[PDB]
Each structure stands twice: as structure tokens, then as C-alpha cells.
């Protein structure tokens, strides 16, 4: 016996990405699953109101303030599909956890740490994981950044390249600044990597994951936007990613260290930048999207991981850490 | 009076009975109406007047509503997490009154999680430059890689009070703490331990200036700072000012509160030093500590000129001063 409650949409920037990714999960979950929808303005809706906000994908405005009077015991497992802020950083893990029932993904702290783009790189520094060069700013303190332009200015807990903006001097730093900040009360400025070649790696399982083959994005824009992540034909996916055999075994091993430091439980994306034959972890993302133009469910379908098979393991795993 | 508090004690940890001890002492000096909600130690939920009954008892093993509980969260201004570890401390609590958007006293969720992984924040204070004591991280079902030489001291990655840890002095007496401690997490670390170590300790209040409490030290007749220690009246020494030179001292509050900003810390903390030979290392940080009859926090403070109705009075208006912020 199973059935699955799906959560999707969201406050955060990306409520339009989620609701596409709770249309790819609802076409291939092998179990029956009902959907709730969180709207733009935090209230829930539920049964027929929840379907007819992802056939509208977007939801706007709400009718259950939180929480909401959901009979949550009818349901074995819980998926939350929430992209960034309030979603993916622990947030939401939070209540579920006190709730008492099954979820798929990441626990509390480390979905917290995986959003937190300045708080993730300092532990995976520290575990001996390359990453990027990179300061944190406060909102309303003085950058002070150490190295040279070009940067990447973000906000910490963005997601689909939201706020992200690429600096070639000094006098456009405010702007990036004050864009990211209008996202977040912390933002990072990265040193950019140019050019850059960009990798990814599906993970799958508890702590201890299992690697997808790795993926290689390539598109024409200046760097990996929004409109480059989420419009047809844009981005191509290169899989296995054409690398030197040594290449790829290291992208795989980083990966799941990464994710063991970080203690993931479910499912991570990990993305890495390849520039002048070193490797650099970018991030990882523990919530990734299911869009028809995201990678997550193509890594692992190369990996001989069908996309029924794939959402059947995320929830089995959420069942086999709730009973330890 | 017209601001309500709302105050939660309790929880599912085995700081049941200590979060109860501080509930205690936080209602007898709080300078706002307060009403206490208490999470039995099976989960469930005691409101009104079958809160201060459990109270009274000193323990909650059950309870009567389960989560979500029937509260009127409208009627409180801010509410007081005082839940002491898994579930409470560690931002659970914090994610659902995030969601619930009422201001909240201490710590966010990531800052939360953070502090009480004994593993993850020691690997994000190495990185700031602060001096922590070398360490390794052992996982449930994963043989021990220890780079160093006993004696040890073993710890569930998410305790609180002591609870779940062992001084081992022989390598053959390793995999007995690790079974202790994996009864409380899947998680566990394994720190070389310091003797002699004098154990001092620094309260922190504030959101964006904290400012730091004097040093307090702890001294004791048991093998190490434990739980019967902890809490047992009389029998922990607790000396405020710590006697130490003026220079040490200001260095502990220095470490104290550049850990407090590298970790993200909101409202309070108890910072927690080792001094061994000279050496100053940073043993761990408490978003939510102890205000129990022989806890430091309030004292450390009290001797800083900040009175116990005062600091918590700080403690809430810090709460409201955060959320309007946003
Ligand atoms: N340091 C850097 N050097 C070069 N390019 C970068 C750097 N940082 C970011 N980029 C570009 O910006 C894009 C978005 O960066 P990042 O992965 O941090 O955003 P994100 O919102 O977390 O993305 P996702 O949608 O995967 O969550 C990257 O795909 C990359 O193309
Ligand atoms: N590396 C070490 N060297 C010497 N003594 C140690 C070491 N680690 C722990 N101890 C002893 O164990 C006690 C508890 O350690 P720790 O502070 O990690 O536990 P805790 O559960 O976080 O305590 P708290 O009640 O402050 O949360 C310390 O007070 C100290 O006396
Ligand atoms: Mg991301
Ligand atoms: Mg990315
Ligand atoms: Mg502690
Ligand atoms: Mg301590
Ligand atoms: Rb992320
Ligand atoms: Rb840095
Ligand atoms: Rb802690
Ligand atoms: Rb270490």
C-alpha cells in the first residue's frame, strides 16, 4: 500500500518551475498521488483547486492559510517538489518532520546547507572539495571582493539562475548587487570561470548515493539563464559528457563526497564547472527540477534508471531512513 | 503589558527533562505575559493548564494533541523555542514557525542545523580560521578512521547534556562508545581529547552586533562535564569572572563572537572554549542554551550588568527586530 502526497509550487522564485516539475513527476510516479499546491502568497490548495492551479501553472493566490486542514493521514509518503526558499532549504522539511510522516529528499540540515551557496562551499572547501573563489555579502554592508573581474553575483539561496548576474567591472557590482539582494538578505560574488564547461551528476540513495553517468549542458547564451534552462531546444545535454577517462571518475567521486560531507538523504544534482582542466564544484541542488527541459531524470535514464523506476526509489528511499 | 509570549518546553529529546528545568526558570523571570505550551516526550502537545501540571512533574512522557496542535498562534507576539536538542534546537521547530510566519526568538533554520552538528560546524569553523580540536566524523555502519591517538572523546553528532558521550582511553574501548553514541544519531564524532583542559564559556546576545557576555569557567570533581554534573545542584563550580589573565579573556570573546557571525547565530548563544596548554579551542556553540538553576547563560550575563527580566526582555524585542527586517 501506497499513496504519495505531492507538494509543489511555492513562494519562492521558482513557483513556476516547481509546478512544471510536479506535471513530470504526476506523469510517471508509479504510485497514486494526490497534489497540493502551495500559491504565490503561502495558502494551500487542495484536490480539484490544486489541479486546475497546475493546469493554469501558477498559482498566484491561495485558499488554506498554513497549515492546512489536510488529511495528512491518508498519505504513506510525502514528496515535496518545492523549489528554493521555503522549499528546499529545511524549511518545509521542518514541519514534515514534526508531522511525523515520510518525505522524499534531503533532512533539515542538509537541505539548509545545500541552498546556502556561501554556508556549502565553506564545508566543501574545508573537506578538501575545489570550489570557485568567492566572498559573502550582507545586504547593506561594503563588497570587498579579492580578486579580479569578471564575477558572478548571486543571491545565497537562488535558484534557476534567479538574480544572477555576470560583472565585467568594478561600477557595475552595486547593480548586481542590489538585483541579488532583492532575493535575499545574503548574496555571494563568485570568480568567473571563462571560458567554462559545465557538468553534472545525478545522485541517488541515502548518505551513502549512487552516481548517474555525467552530463554535459551546452548552449549559446551568455551564460545558463533562465530563459536558457527553462525554453525547448536551448540547452543540450551531452551524455555520457565527452571527458578524458580520469575526468569522469573524479567528477563521480567529488560528487558523492560532497553529498556523504553534506549527509543528503534522497536525491542531489550536483553541478560542477571544468575551466583550463581543473574541476570546480558549483553546488547541489536537493530538489531538482523535473521540467521537461531539466537533467536530473536524463542523468539517471542514461544510467539505465528509468524515469518510473527513479521516482519509485526516491520514495522508497524516504521510507527506508523513516524506519532507520 | 500588552505583548503575550508564547513559550514551548519539552520535546522529544533526551533534553526532555532540562528543557522543562529551564522553562521553569525562563517563566519565574520573564518580564511579559507568557503561556507555556509543552511537547510530551511521545510528541504530542500540552496546552493550558495541562502545561503547567507536566511542569510541576518535571517530565511529559504523553501527550494529547498531536502536531499540529490546536493552538491560537494569532494570540502571541513572539513565540520562545526553549527546546533543548533533536527536534527543537537543531531547526525543526524553526522551519514550521517560518511557515507559520510569527517571530520566533534565537537562531534561524540553517544557523539552527548548523550549530547543533557537532561535525558541520566544526568543518565551518576550521574554515573561518577558528581553532577547534582535531576530529573525525564516524558514520553508522562505517569502520572508525581515526588519524590520531587516543584518549578519545566520543559524541552523537546532534547530543546535548552530555548525553551519549564516553572518554575513551583504549583504542579496543572505541567501538562501545560508537554503539553508545549511535543510539542517539547515525552520526558520531571522535575528538581528541584535551588533559588537563580548563572549560570556559561566553554568552552572546544579538542579531547583526552581538555582544559578548564576561568568560565564565566551569570546574568539577567527575571525569568530564557530565550530565549528572550538569545539573546535579552544587556539584558543578561555576566561576564568573573565569580567573584568568585580562588578555585570555578578551581573545575568548573575540573567538566567541566571530564564531557567532561565521555561523549565522541570531538572538543568543553559549559559546563553549577549551584551554589546554596555552591553547584556546572552540568546543561547540548552543543556539538555545539551558536556563536551568545551574546553567551559565543567565548568570554570565547577570554578571555583565544585564539582569535576568532584562535579558529576556532582549531576547524578544531581538525577535521582533529580526522578522521586521525580514
Ligand atoms: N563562478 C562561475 N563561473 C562561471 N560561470 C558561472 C559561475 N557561477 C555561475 N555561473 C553560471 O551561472 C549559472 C547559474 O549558476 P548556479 O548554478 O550557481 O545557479 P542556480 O540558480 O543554483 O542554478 P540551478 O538552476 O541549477 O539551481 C551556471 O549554470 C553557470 O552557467
Ligand atoms: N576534546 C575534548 N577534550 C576534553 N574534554 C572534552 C572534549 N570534548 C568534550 N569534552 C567534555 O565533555 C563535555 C561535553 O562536551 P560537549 O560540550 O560537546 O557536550 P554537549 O552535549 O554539547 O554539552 P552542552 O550541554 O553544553 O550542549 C565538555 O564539557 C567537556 O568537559
Ligand atoms: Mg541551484
Ligand atoms: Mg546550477
Ligand atoms: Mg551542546
Ligand atoms: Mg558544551
Ligand atoms: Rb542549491
Ligand atoms: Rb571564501
Ligand atoms: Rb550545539
Ligand atoms: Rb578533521
Not at 563521480?252 to 563526497?257: I, Y
Request: glycine residues 8%.
Amino acid at each position: 500500500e501506497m499513496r504519495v502526497l505531492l507538494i509543489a509550487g511555492g513562494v519562492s522564485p521558482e513557483h513556476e518551475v516547481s509546478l512544471l516539475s510536479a506535471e513530470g513527476v504526476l506523469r510517471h510516479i508509479p504510485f497514486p498521488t494526490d497534489l497540493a499546491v502551495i500559491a504565490q502568497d503561502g495558502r494551500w490548495l487542495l484536490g480539484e483547486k490544486a489541479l486546475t492551479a497546475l493546469e493554469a501553472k501558477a498559482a498566484p493566490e491561495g485558499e488554506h492559510p498554513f497549515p492546512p486542514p489536510l488529511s495528512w493521514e491518508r498519505y504513506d509518503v510525502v514528496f515535496p517538489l518545492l523549489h528554493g526558499r521555503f522549499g528546499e532549504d529545511g524549511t518545509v522539511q521542518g514541519f514534515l518532520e514534526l508531522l511525523g510522516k515520510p518525505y522524499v529528499g534531503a533532512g533539515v540540515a542538509a537541505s539548509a546547507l545545500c541552498m546556502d551557496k556561501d554556508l556549502s562551499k565553506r564545508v566543501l572547501a574545508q573537506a578538501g572539495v575545489p570550489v570557485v573563489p568567492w566572498v559573502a555579502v550582507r545586504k547593506g554592508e561594503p563588497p570587498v571582493v579579492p580578486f579580479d573581474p569578471p564575477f558572478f553575483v548571486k543571491p545565497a539561496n537562488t535558484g534557476s539562475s534567479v538574480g544572477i548576474s555576470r560583472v565585467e567591472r568594478f561600477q557595475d557590482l552595486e547593480a548586481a548587487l542590489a538585483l541579488a539582494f532583492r532575493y535575499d538578505e545574503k548574496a555571494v560574488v563568485e570568480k568567473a570561470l571563462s571560458p567554462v564547461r559545465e557538468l553534472e551528476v545525478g545522485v541517488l540513495g541515502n548518505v551513502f548515493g549512487e552516481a548517474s553517468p555525467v552530463g554535459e549542458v551546452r548552449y549559446e547564451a551568455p551564460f545558463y539563464d533562465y530563459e536558457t534552462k527553462y525554453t525547448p531546444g536551448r540547452a543540450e545535454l551531452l551524455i555520457p559528457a565527452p571527458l578524458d577517462p580520469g575526468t569522469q571518475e573524479t567528477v563521480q567521486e567529488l560528487a558523492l563526497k560532497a553529498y556523504k560531507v553534506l549527509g543528503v538523504r534522497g536525491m542531489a544534482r550536483v553541478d560542477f564547472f571544468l575551466a583550463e582542466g581543473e574541476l570546480y564544484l558549483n553546488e547541489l541542488n536537493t530538489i531538482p527540477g523535473f521540467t521537461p527541459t531539466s537533467m536530473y531524470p536524463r542523468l539517471f535514464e542514461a544510467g539505465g534508471v528509468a524515469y518510473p523506476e527513479l521516482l519509485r526509489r526516491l520514495v522508497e528511499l524516504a521510507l527506508t531512513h523513516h524506519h532507520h
